[PDB]
Amino acid sequence: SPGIWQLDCTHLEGKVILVAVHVASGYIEAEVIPAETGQETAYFLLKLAGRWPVKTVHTDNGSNFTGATVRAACDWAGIKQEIESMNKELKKIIGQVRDQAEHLKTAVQMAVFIHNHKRKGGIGGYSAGERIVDIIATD
Amino acid sequence: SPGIWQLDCTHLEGKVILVAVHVASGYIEAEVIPAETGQETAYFLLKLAGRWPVKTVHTDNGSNFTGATVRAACDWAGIKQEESMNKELKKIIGQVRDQAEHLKTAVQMAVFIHNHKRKYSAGERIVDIIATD
Ligand SMILES: Cn1nc(-c2ccc3c(c2)OCO3)cc1N
Ligand SMILES: Cn1nc(-c2ccc3c(c2)OCO3)cc1N
Ligand SMILES: [Cl-]
Ligand SMILES: [Cl-]
Numbered sequence: 001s002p003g004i005w006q007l008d009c010t011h012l013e014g015k016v017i018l019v020a021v022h023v024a025s026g027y028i029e030a031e032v033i034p035a036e037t038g039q040e041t042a043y044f045l046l047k048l049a050g051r052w053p054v055k056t057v058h059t060d061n062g063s064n065f066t067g068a069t070v071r072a073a074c075d076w077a078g079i080k081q082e083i084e085s086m087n088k089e090l091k092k093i094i095g096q097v098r099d100q101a102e103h104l105k106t107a108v109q110m111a112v113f114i115h116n117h118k119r120k121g122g123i124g125g126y127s128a129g130e131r132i133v134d135i136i137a138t139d
Numbered sequence: 140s141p142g143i144w145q146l147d148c149t150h151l152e153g154k155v156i157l158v159a160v161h162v163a164s165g166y167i168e169a170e171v172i173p174a175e176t177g178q179e180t181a182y183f184l185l186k187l188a189g190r191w192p193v194k195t196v197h198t199d200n201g202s203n204f205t206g207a208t209v210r211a212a213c214d215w216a217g218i219k220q221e222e223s224m225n226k227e228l229k230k231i232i233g234q235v236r237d238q239a240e241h242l243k244t245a246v247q248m249a250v251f252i253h254n255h256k257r258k259y260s261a262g263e264r265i266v267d268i269i270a271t272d
Contacts, residue, residue: 029190031186043247046244046247050247050255051190051250051254052262053255053262105182106185109185110189112189113189115189129190129191129192133266133269133270136266136270137269137270137271138270
């Protein structure tokens with residue numbers, strides 16, 4: 001279950017954002033992509049799998065996962081295929097920082113930063129970033 | 140020290156790749172970027188610091204770091220400013236190059252192979268070091 005991620009799309013300002021959540025920790029990797037296509041989805045998946053030990057991705061099973069490119073990426077990376085709060089928590093933070101960035105993509109990364117660093121248990125709490133690392137180090 | 144990363148540029152096929160290395164593990168984050176500008180550098184650094192606990196980046200201190208935007212980014216993310224796997228990464232990019240239509244895909248395959256290669260991987264090492272703390 002350390003290797004399980006959920007991947008979803010979210011949309012803002014006519015642009016596409018892919019959001020991957022590490023199910024066990026709530027840690028997020030997210031990016032504006034140029035189009036919800038097989039090619040760009042395969043790219044985002046290859047990027048994620050090269051940074052974290054991704055075994056399984058739960059996805060919406062939509063059009064951008066049916067093509068030979070994404071299947072080929074998943075195969076290659078050793079990944080098998082088998083929310084809304086995140087995507088709206090993420091939206092909220094994005095709205096909160098939207099002013100200070102020219103480009104949506106910058107705000108997206110600021111939002112991912114705040115989400116992964118936020119310690120919400122007070123003095124005891126763990127950030128999503130501390131949680132992913134603890135879970136994966138444990139195994 | 141867990142929070143220390145080294146950031147360098149490398150150039151292939153007329154395009155610019157930023158490579159961040161987590162010094163204690165050898166783990167790598169790397170991306171083709173549109174141009175070696177302060178804007179794009181600031182963006183790559185914000186991405187990195189949102190994904191790992193970056194305290195200090197050692198950079199080449201060149202032009203893309205002197206501007207309002209990168210300074211502002213580092214300040215905001217709480218980063219202070221104070222290349223072996225860089226030839227290695229090009230080697231891996233050389234080996235996978237045929238299978239990618241686009242260089243940026245080869246780059247990410249190369250990052251994948253570098254971070255997962257065992258014989259602990261760099262990916263296991265960064266997580267152990269940072270969990271340690
Ligand atoms: C102290 N510490 N910090 C982290 C940590 C790990 C990943 C992160 C992060 C913090 O912010 C963005 O992504 C893990 C531990 N043990
Ligand atoms: C088993 N295992 N695998 C990892 C691991 C962590 C990060 C990675 C990776 C593997 O490949 C690409 O980036 C960490 C542990 N403990
Ligand atoms: Cl999607
Ligand atoms: Cl640089």
